[PDB]
A and B are shown apart, each in its own frame.
Chain A
Amino acid sequence: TQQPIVTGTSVISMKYDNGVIIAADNLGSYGSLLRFNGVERLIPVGDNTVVGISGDISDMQHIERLLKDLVTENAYDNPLADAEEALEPSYIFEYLATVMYQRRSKMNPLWNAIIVAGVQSNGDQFLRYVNLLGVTYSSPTLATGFGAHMANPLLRKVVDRESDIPKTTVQVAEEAIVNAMRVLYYRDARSSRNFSLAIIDKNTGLTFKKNLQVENMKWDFAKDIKGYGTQKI
């Protein structure tokens, strides 16, 4: 029995023809106070998996440590640690899902929502979600928090079913993700302008972009809005 203190807002993501994209802003809020600004909420594991996390940051840091320990443990007595016995995204996910459900079952949850994005060794795209209740699901697009409400409807306009994935290039998909992040900055009172984005491509591998910014914002029409109904000047 917990209550989240320092928190991270939405994590958004989608599959495209060759891989997966995932993004999340760099903010750690403390209620309504925007307390911390250099917070990385995407954690890469190997060169084939990124784990994006929302919710309590102290629990996120705990999960970071679990993942970094998992890499270490997998290398132990494993001569194929950087080859056939490298950690897959599906392994990293199931491990996290197992922990999340055990912690909910002990009435002491890790107060997070997690999206595991990556590419399996056979080239398949992996995107799956798990949260504090141990609930899990897969979809061509996934988001947490306000992201689920505002990003999903936008990202599903691009990939609305399985068959739309081959038809979607990485330029198209990155556009959709970056636009979705702008919207969230317009509308989520606990978002920041700065964010990180990562692509995991079955050919180019992992590209991790830091210090992105929301740009091309429409604010001009604000000048024409006077009063709340009848006022003119």
Chain B
Amino acid sequence: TTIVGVKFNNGVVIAADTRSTQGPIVADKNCAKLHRISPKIWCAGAGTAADTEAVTQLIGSNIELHSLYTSREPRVVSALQMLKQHLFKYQGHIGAYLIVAGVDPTGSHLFSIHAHGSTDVGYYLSLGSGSLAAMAVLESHWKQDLTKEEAIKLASDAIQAGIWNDLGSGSNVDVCVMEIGKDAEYLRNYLTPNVREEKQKSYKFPRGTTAVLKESIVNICD
């Protein structure tokens, strides 16, 4: 994977590529690595696919219950603490590598969490196999005081570095923008720069091509 997070003037933006791999094989050309923990707290996840989905839902569930119990909008630092303490307990065996971001009553926040349970704070971050390609771009173009549109460009540029230069990353760019005072906007397939070309030929077969031994109607009813 490649994933990033970039802060800006009124908020924070995260982005991710959309490739899943099983060894050298591309298992999924368009999976969603952006997760909603709560409406205005989103997560990007790299590592063991099931682990990032499962850990993200569990903490999303408990955050919802907590938000209800306290009559407050959830804070990013609560997701952060809950995620990190869970991951630490599992000593690295839950392979989730996350960039957590969102807006809450305290402001806008950007964090990363490694699988053994350490957390980092920054204005720009990247994780995954594509993280060095992305970080090269971020270190080259990031500045203090980015506008929302600059931040989006910077983020998707960093994801693009991963897509082109990392064999662990490909296909599309997903983005999510969390601005203070506004709804999070989740931009699924924000960029689609890897559209398959038209095939040369149609492989649709003459009907009857396949040799059949038996038919029968299957009973799905009651």
Residues of A within 8 A of B (CB): 146, 149-154, 156, 179-180, 182-183, 186-187, 218, 220-221, 224-230
Contacts and interface: CB of A to CB of B under 8 A. Distances in A.
Interface in B144-181: 144, 161, 164-165
20 contacts: A149-B136, A150-B135, A150-B136, A152-B165, A153-B133, A153-B165, A154-B136, A154-B137, A156-B164, A179-B140, A183-B136, A186-B139, A187-B136, A218-B142, A221-B123, A221-B144, A225-B122, A228-B118, A229-B111, A230-B77
B80 interface: yes
Secondary structure at chain A's binding surface: helix, strand, loop or mixed? helix
- B interface residue count range (under 10 / 10 to 19 / 20 to 34 / 35 or more): 20 to 34
Contact of A228 (B120, B164, B165): B120
Give 4 closest A-B pairs by Cβ, nearest first: A149-B132, A153-B165, A150-B136, A153-B133
Interface of B: 77, 80-81, 84, 111, 118-123, 132-133, 135-137, 139-140, 142-144, 161, 164-165
A150 B139 CA distance: 10
Nearest to A231: B121
Contacts of B118: 228
A150 B132 contact: yes
Given A151-B136, A228-B121, 20 more contacts: A146-B132, A149-B136, A153-B133, A153-B136, A156-B165, A183-B136, A183-B140, A187-B135, A218-B142, A220-B144, A221-B123, A221-B144, A224-B123, A227-B121, A228-B118, A228-B119, A228-B120, A229-B81, A229-B119, A230-B80
Contact of A187 (B139, B144, B165): B139
Contact of A229 (B84, B123, B137, B165): B84
